[PDB]
Design a protein around this ligand. Structure first.
Ligand SMILES: O=C(N[C@@H](C(=O)NO)c1ccc(-c2cc(F)c(F)c(F)c2)cc1)C1CCOCC1
Ligand SMILES: [Mg+2]
Ligand SMILES: [Mg+2]
Ligand SMILES: [Mg+2]
Ligand SMILES: [Mg+2]
Ligand SMILES: [Zn+2]
Length: 889
């Protein structure tokens, strides 16, 4: 079980300068011939030449056109090809090989595989070695010359990286295309695609050099009408990188390709980006609203990689967050600017503080730059991506836009065309910091702890105001809990964006201010503060931390109503909810533990409910924001605050609080649901696939949120509204009608209707599956069994499997049934999936991540299933490594 250590990085004893490939796709096998033009590096010490090569069938191998013979000159063990040093040349040489691989049966979707009728590759992180022999690490940079041949009727469209330089006919109904890609690249950016693809195309003219760039977006013929939004998003992405960062695309063509079978969202192969269909294809008739923001962010994300990851690449895989954290940060800047809605930033924070905070307090906790790995396929985590992005975003907060842009350009100009490490980025930012501080002794050495230290900091506050002195103080403390990675945690460089709100008129009392907390604690003093303020802390969520604001609910309400910052208003609301949840949770727990015949519950703060009404009734307030304030905090956010969480008692707690608020506000909810209809469901642009209105989508989100609240409440005659909603042309609406109808006798009527609307579009059917999976149904186990037998069957499509099972696992009452039947069901699915796709099997483990946070009976039930999975003789390396770490074994 080999463990790779970050401290152990050493350059290769070899160099690969040129790769020349011939990939010949046939009915039952694919033959791959490769010539590697190689050299001996300055670091060479006469070692054996060892290539990565996994699952390859050797037809022959040769060095300088002399055939090597197995046993005497090389060994191959299905993982490593070892050529004994005595047979390795001591200057430039050519290594060649011919191997056979089998994309048709490659269900793990790594290396070269078949997705429906499309042949496609996925080489990040170490999948290139599943295609041919190589020294498969990102610092082995080479030029590529790639020829693909295939049956012309089955596979008329052939793509790889670089320029297509020849197209030719082959006897027996075949044809070939040659692609030459002269700029150096790492092998994880190699891609090839063959299929009967249809496309939309456009020409983009770059801002400064005025280069013509051809843009192509591809899919199977059936879905070619779902490609338009993606092409628009690509145009938008190019413009943003030009306008914000001054960066233009350097190649003459960019291809985007949708495939049905994909382990993740998309992949940034140079000039040839490959997408999960659910993150590239949409139409207003056949997609829910979420698809539109999804496609925007994922097209943007892969485009921004062309600089951050492709032109500046990675020295080694421990630097992953350097390209992923930075590209998520660039993706988020882009998405905020395109959507112009405050909920975009809020949604990022909501994700981080639920899913990533849970990971960071689990046995899986790691820093954004880990010290070791076993499985690279297990390294692509919300910590590396989303905490990485918040760490990349803090540089912008600290430096401000002008010096951030200066520092970023330093990074690009200094590292363009090369590999890089996290230190290279910190160094570029540090140079800008020196300039900003007018102080060449200033440094960001402490900032590096954000890369190495695991766990979420807790930042807490105390205040003091002297009315005679007009002097205000904010005392701040930071603390990170020790974990298995560091016994002693050090203080971080924490930027705290703050305002001070005058509680009498709601106005700002100071200019924009970012406190730089660099010690365990500090006191920040403000003079000439005319009245005692309410502090507005961590505006924009300015650091990835647990915020303990120590404000009263009266103070939080004032901020919720009158503060200028969307995040602090949302966080203030969040904190009011959490105080209530923790209080009611323990009142319910106590009643349970003590077997009480009667007891009391503390009601929801009535002034809080008044503030929600006030905001809801304000026509100038944002519909997206409104949808957040009527929703309780995510279960996975709440669990970070409760030990031995009894999920039944939490379910009862949430139910009580929702009922309290609905008992006061349901008539308001209904009135709004009706008044929002005209603008929310406006059909003016329903047949214009390039017109996307994020505000209007937020109005639909608000309506569908309100409808859910009124349905759960059995508001008088709401079923009438539900039935009319099922007739809406928008899938977000008519799928909503299915899940809110769970509380009525018409659920299976709506089940059949919406199935019939969904079944003939692959992606829509998957959205229907999710809607069913997440339905609040007492018979949800019987329903899941029906989906398995009637719709899912033995599909190996990850989208299908994830759609059926993951939403169900968020069902607090049912997934966590005290019998353990839900844990048993998901473990059976994990073990089944692990036989053919270990990466997705590990994704399906996600519900188990919080296992040691639950009540002791459920900890035991979850642990039993994980140990049962660990005992399967045929368990994959991925799944074994993951469960071993998760169960602290
Ligand atoms: O699709 C996503 N991430 C991919 C990415 O960063 N694209 O630029 C991504 C790509 C490949 C992998 C990956 C890693 C492996 F080790 C592996 F075997 C594999 F098949 C894919 C994981 C995530 C996320 C979801 C969509 O928005 C971007 C984040
Ligand atoms: Mg094989
Ligand atoms: Mg422009
Ligand atoms: Mg994203
Ligand atoms: Mg299918
Ligand atoms: Zn990425």
């Amino acid at each position: 079980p080999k463990i790779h250590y970050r401290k152990d990085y050493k350059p290769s004893g070899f160099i690969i300068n040129q790769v020349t490939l011939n990939i010949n796709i046939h009915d039952q096998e694919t033959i791959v011939r490769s010539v590697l033009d190689m050299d001996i590096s300055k670091h060479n010490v006469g070692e054996d030449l060892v290539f990565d090569g996994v699952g390859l069938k050797i037809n022959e191998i040769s060095i300088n056109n002399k055939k090597l013979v197995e046993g005497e000159e090389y060994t191959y063990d299905n993982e490593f090809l070892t050529i004994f040093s005595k047979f390795v040349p001591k200057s430039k040489f050519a290594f060649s090989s011919e191997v056979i691989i089998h994309p048709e049966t490659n269900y793990a979707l790594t290396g070269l595989y078949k997705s429906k009728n499309i042949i496609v590759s996925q080489c990040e992180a170490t999948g290139f070695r599943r295609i041919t022999f190589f020294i498969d690490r990102p610092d082995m940079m080479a030029k590529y010359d790639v020829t693909v041949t295939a049956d012309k009727e089955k596979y008329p469209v052939l793509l790889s990286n670089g320029d297509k330089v020849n197209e030719f006919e082959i006897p027996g109904g075949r044809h070939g295309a040659r692609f030459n890609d002269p700029p150096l690249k790492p092998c994880y950016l190699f891609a090839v695609v063959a299929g009967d693809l249809k496309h939309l195309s456009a020409t983009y003219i770059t801002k400064y050099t005025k280069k013509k760039v051809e843009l192509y977006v591809f899919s199977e013929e059936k879905y070619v009408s779902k490609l338009q939004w993606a092409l628009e998003c690509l145009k938008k992405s190019m413009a943003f990188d030009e306008d914000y960062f001054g960066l233009e695309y350097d190649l003459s063509r960019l291809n985007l390709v949708a495939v049905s079978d994909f382990n993740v969202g998309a992949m940034e192969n140079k000039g040839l980006n490959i997408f999960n269909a659910n993150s590239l294809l949409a139409s207003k008739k056949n997609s829910i609203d979420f698809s539109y923001a999804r496609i925007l962010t994922v097209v943007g994300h892969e485009y921004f990689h062309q600089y951050t990851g492709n032109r500046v690449t990675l020295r080694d895989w421990f630097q992953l967050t350097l390209k992923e954290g930075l590209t998520v940060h660039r993706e988020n800047l882009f998405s905020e600017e395109m959507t112009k809605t405050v909920t975009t930033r809020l949604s990022h924070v909501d994700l981080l503080r639920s899913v990533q905070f849970l990971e960071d307090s689990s046995p899986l906790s790691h820093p954004i730059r880990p010290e070791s790995y076993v499985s690279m396929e297990n390294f692509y985590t919300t910590t590396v991506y989303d905490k990485g992005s918040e760490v990349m975003r803090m540089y912008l907060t600290i430096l401000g836009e002008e010096y951030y842009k200066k520092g970023f350009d330093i990074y690009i100009k200094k590292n363009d065309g090369n590999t890089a490490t996290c230190e290279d980025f910190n160094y570029a930012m540090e140079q800008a910091y020196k300039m900003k501080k007018a102080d060449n002794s200033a440094n960001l050495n402490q900032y590096l702890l954000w890369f190495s230290q695991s766990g979420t900091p807790h930042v807490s506050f105390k205040y003091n105001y002297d009315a005679e002195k007009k002097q205000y103080s904010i005392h701040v403390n930071q603390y990170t809990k020790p974990d298995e990675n560091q016994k002693e945690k050090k203080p971080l460089f924490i930027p705290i964006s703050v305002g001070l709100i005058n509680p009498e008129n709601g106005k700002e009392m100071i200019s924009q201010t970012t406190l730089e907390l660099t010690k365990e604690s500090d006191t920040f003093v403000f003079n000439n503060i005319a009245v005692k303020p309410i502090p507005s802390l961590f505006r924009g969520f300015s650091a990835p931390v647990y915020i303990e604001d120590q404000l009263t609910d009266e103070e939080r309400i004032l901020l919720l109503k009158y503060d200028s910052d969307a995040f602090v208003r949302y966080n203030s609301c969040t904190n009011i909810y959490m105080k209530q949840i923790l209080m009611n949770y323990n009142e319910f727990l106590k009643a349970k533990n003590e077997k009480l015949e009667s007891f009391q519950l503390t009601p929801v703060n009535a002034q809080f409910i008044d503030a929600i009404k006030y905001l809801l009734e304000d026509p100038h307030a944002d519909a997206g924001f409104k949808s957040y304030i009527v929703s309780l905090p995510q279960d996975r956010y709440i669990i970070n605050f409760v030990s031995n969480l009894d999920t039944d008692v939490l379910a009862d707690t949430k139910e009580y609080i929702y009922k309290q608020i609905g008992d006061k506000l349901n008539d308001v909810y209904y009135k709004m649901f009706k008044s929002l209809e005209a603008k929310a469901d406006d059909l003016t642009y329903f047949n214009d696939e390039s017109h996307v209105d994020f505000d209007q989508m937020n109005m639909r989100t608000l309506r569908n949120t309100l409808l859910s609240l009124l349905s759960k409440a059995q508001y008088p005659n709401i079923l009438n509204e539900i039935i009319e909603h099922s007739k809406s042309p928008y899938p977000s609406n008519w799928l909503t009608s299915l899940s809110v109808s769970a509380y009525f006798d018409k659920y299976f009527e709506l089940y059949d209707k919406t199935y019939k609307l969904s079944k003939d579009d692959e992606l829509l059917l998957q959205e229907w599956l999710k809607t069913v999976s997440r339905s609040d149904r007492k018979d949800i186990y019987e329903i899941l069994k029906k989906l398995e037998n009637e719709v899912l069957k033995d599909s190996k499509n990850p989208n299908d499997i994830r759609a059926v099972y993951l939403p169900f696992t968020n069902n607090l009452r049912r997934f966590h049934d005290i019998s353990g039947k839900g844990y048993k069901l998901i473990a059976e699915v994990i073990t089944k999936t692990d036989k053919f796709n270990p990466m997705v099997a590990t994704q399906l483990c996600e519900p188990f991540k919080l296992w040691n946070k639950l009540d002791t009976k459920r900890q035991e039930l979850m642990l039993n299933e994980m140990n049962t999975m660990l005992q399967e003789p045929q368990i994959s390396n991925n799944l074994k490594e993951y469960l071993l770490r998760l169960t602290n074994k």
